């Protein structure tokens, strides 16, 4: 057997955290492979694997076991306990077919016209601003638009509210389950918002609140297993949330996106005439480009081949993400932001997977994906077509590589909002 | 000669106020006639005349001079001081040009994708509340539209409270230039809108706002006459107000509307459908059906002959709007709700004219009438496509003919507002 390169220690976690979205292609580059090990979370041997066969195999359910892989303290701050990421089998499926209930053409063109017309109805608040964080300012407008799409009727405080909680929640994986400062606040944060759906969850059930039928809270609210009974009440809070705080979690996207309208002059017209499809182009070139999910966890099932190495049964095995994204191989000129790219994209569920690859039904993929690209596309076409802006000089527009979670450090801030109407009129 | 019937009174003024949108009507009926006349007004002669030929009388500028007619407390408390509805000549053809500048095919869009977005993020608070009152939610909605349409920033408070000054200002044509308990009242709150107005004009001038190019405010501010001078400050604010006030008072059609989609059940399928322009149609069909403006005044330039009577020269003379707008020979059935009859209307400028008749440039037909169309239309699909409600029902939903101004007497009540949107998911 040719011997998967090691990156040595007894444990190489702190490597891993001081490194970031880098650690990984830095070895794929270091030992010239596409699989190498190394010892983290506590010692334990570690596989890595990086590409498009990679990934094809990470999600065949026949060679990988994905249960309990997730790190407890990941678990327990950003995904809830018994959260569909951690359920398998039957259970994940018929769980999943829940979420994925939700996603019809239909629900998703509301979406599409709350999102666009939520940033319409915006444009005279930001006029009045003087500076705008488009990360924060789109934290909070996608709580509005998430909560009001899933039913969930918040005041404008309690929208405030859950944004900040959910937002320290998505930021919760940047330790990639070791112990950290923040471990106890987002705990906390998390048992808030919990608690603040199951009370909704709770209503319902006993007929105090009435959210249409087709919305995720009513739809969560009255779900039966395949043996007839209600997720109980806090489970259901749990898997809600797993709806609404990473819809919330686009905002890191939107700030991306404004970003790369920045840096890559010509884009915004592009994206503004939206012709051939440039806008979901662009906003596929983004979730590709910037960094936001590093890896994945798993454990194989049986013993593997790949690249001419043996994987073992029970070896704990990671999935690149960011590093995928950036594989020279896959896309030409992988650290060039060009859209276009997407025009012969052959639609492959194992190379673009920002958000997990594989099957929506019977792999973990997002089940969000589509939304994701509904409410970036709004998003994009609104800051490029809508309103006119200076990106403000002082600031750090730059994105660290070397630091999880991945964002624009500034947030991505902007000054001197005007709509952007043509008007045509000739004065008289 | 032919003598025209007499309505017979040294003053038959309390006459029309007591019959209100019937006087003209039941004199039409009891002398069977085309024309006739009263004394009105301090006793002075004045002729009324109905129908399409006599539009176009009315509005051909050789036999017709409309200035110095208007009853003097209605300038006061409606249009204002020098308003353009004041002018003649030159002079008002020039001023005209300034309103219609802003009429542009995509100054429209905008005013039609405001009035669509607005309504749409109206939907989370029309669920909010027990009660809606159509008339009085519309006329706030419209002033936040229109302001923004205008370029005019204001506060929620000044937006709830120009709202509530415009109201009794457009209210105040009930007495056709007679005194009457609130004439004062109407005056104050002109002083205010009209000082609102002027002082962010003197702000535009002075070089502290600088609302775009192309919207009302801007253009009014800059525009010069035909001898290169401003409109003084308070007469460019009254001005301006004759394109902000009438918006609101749609209101009142927005009212009769909703009452329409009530009264004749198969209308909301129609207009939500939207096929053939029935939207349109139905939008012409409201304002034709349903009474605000009685007749408007003028005076004979010359002898004139209608009907085999000679109208001298100098006459005080009254075009029905109204009952032209009911007359059984140019509506079949005039007394049906019938949006359908639109599918053969020719578009004389000279039969459906709820808001005058003759040329938009050379007359002094509604500035607003398309924008009045195009806010009608989206509100209209808003109610029925956008929310399902009830009609409340312990209301007056009539309309009291016999009253200036018209409206519906409780304003239009519903009630369970909640957004109707097709979801199409399929519960697992
Ligand atoms: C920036 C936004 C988002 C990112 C980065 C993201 C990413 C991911 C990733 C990496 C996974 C795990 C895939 C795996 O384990 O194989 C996942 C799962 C999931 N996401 Fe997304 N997601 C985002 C937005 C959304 C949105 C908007 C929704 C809305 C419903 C959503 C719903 C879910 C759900 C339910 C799962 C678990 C599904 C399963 O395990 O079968 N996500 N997401
Ligand atoms: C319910 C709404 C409306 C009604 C009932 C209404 C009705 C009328 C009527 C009857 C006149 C006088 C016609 C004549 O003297 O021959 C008029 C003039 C005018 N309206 Fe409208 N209007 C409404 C809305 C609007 C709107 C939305 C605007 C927006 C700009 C507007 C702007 C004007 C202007 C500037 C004039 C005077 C034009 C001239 O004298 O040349 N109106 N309107
Ligand atoms: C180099 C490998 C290091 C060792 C092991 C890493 C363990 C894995 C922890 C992963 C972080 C989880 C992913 C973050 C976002 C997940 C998807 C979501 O937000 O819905
Ligand atoms: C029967 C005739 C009675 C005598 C004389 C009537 C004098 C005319 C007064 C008319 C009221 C004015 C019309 C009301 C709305 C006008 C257009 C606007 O709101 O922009």
Chains 1, 2 share one sequence.
Not at 3 to 27: A, C, F, H, M, W
Not at 230 to 238: E, F, H, N, V, Y
């Amino acid at each position: 057997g040719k011997q998967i390169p090691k990156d040595r220690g007894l444990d190489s976690t702190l490597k891993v955290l001081k490194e970031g979205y880098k650690y990984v292609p830095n070895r794929l580059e270091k030992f010239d492979t596409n699989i190498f090990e190394l010892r983290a979370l506590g010692g334990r041997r570690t596989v890595v694997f990086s590409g498009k066969e990679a990934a094809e195999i990470f999600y065949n359910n026949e060679l990988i076991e994905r249960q309990g892989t997730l790190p407890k303290r990941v678990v327990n701050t950003l995904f809830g306990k018994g959260a569909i990421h951690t359920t398998g089998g039957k259970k994940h499926i018929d769980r999943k077919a829940l979420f994925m209930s939700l996603m019809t053409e239909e629900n998703l063109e509301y979406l599409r016209e709350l999102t666009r017309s939520t940033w319409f109805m915006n444009t005279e608040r930001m006029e009045r601003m003087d500076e705008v964080n488009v990360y924060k300012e789109s934290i909070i407008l996608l709580t509005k638009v998430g909560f009001r799409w899933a039913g969930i009727i918040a005041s404008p405080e309690e929208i405030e509210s859950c944004a900040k909680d959910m937002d320290t929640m998505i930021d919760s994986f940047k330790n990639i389950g070791t112990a950290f400062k923040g471990y106890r606040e987002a705990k906390k944060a998390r048992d808030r918002v919990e608690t603040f759906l199951e009370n909704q969850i709770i209503a319902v059930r006993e007929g105090k609140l009435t959210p249409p039928q087709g919305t995720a809270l009513h739809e969560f609210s009255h779900w039966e297993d395949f043996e007839g009974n209600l997720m109980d009440s806090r489970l259901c809070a749990i898997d809600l949330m797993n709806v609404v705080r990473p819809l919330v979690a686009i905002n890191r996207f939107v700030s991306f996106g404004v970003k790369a309208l920045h840096d890559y002059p010509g884009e915004a017209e592009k994206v503004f005439n939206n012709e051939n499809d440039y806008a979901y182009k662009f906003v596929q070139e983004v979730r590709r480009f910037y960094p936001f999910v590093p890896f994945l966890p798993g454990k194989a099932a049986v013993d593997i081949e790949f690249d001419g190495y043996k994987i073992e049964k029970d070896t704990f095995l990671v999935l690149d993400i960011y590093g995928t994204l950036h594989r020279e191989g896959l896309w030409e000129n992988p650290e060039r932001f060009y859209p276009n790219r997407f025009s012969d994209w052959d639609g492959s569920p194992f190379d673009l997977i920002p958000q997990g690859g594989g099957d929506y039904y019977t792999n973990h993929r997002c089940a969000g994906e589509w939304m994701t690209i509904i409410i970036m596309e709004e998003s994009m076409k609104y800051f490029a077509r809508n309103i006119s802006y200076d990106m403000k000089k002082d600031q750090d527009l730059s994105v660290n590589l070397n630091k999880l979670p991945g964002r624009v450090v500034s947030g991505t801030i902007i000054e001197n909002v005007n709509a952007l109407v043509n008007r045509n009129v000739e004065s008289v």
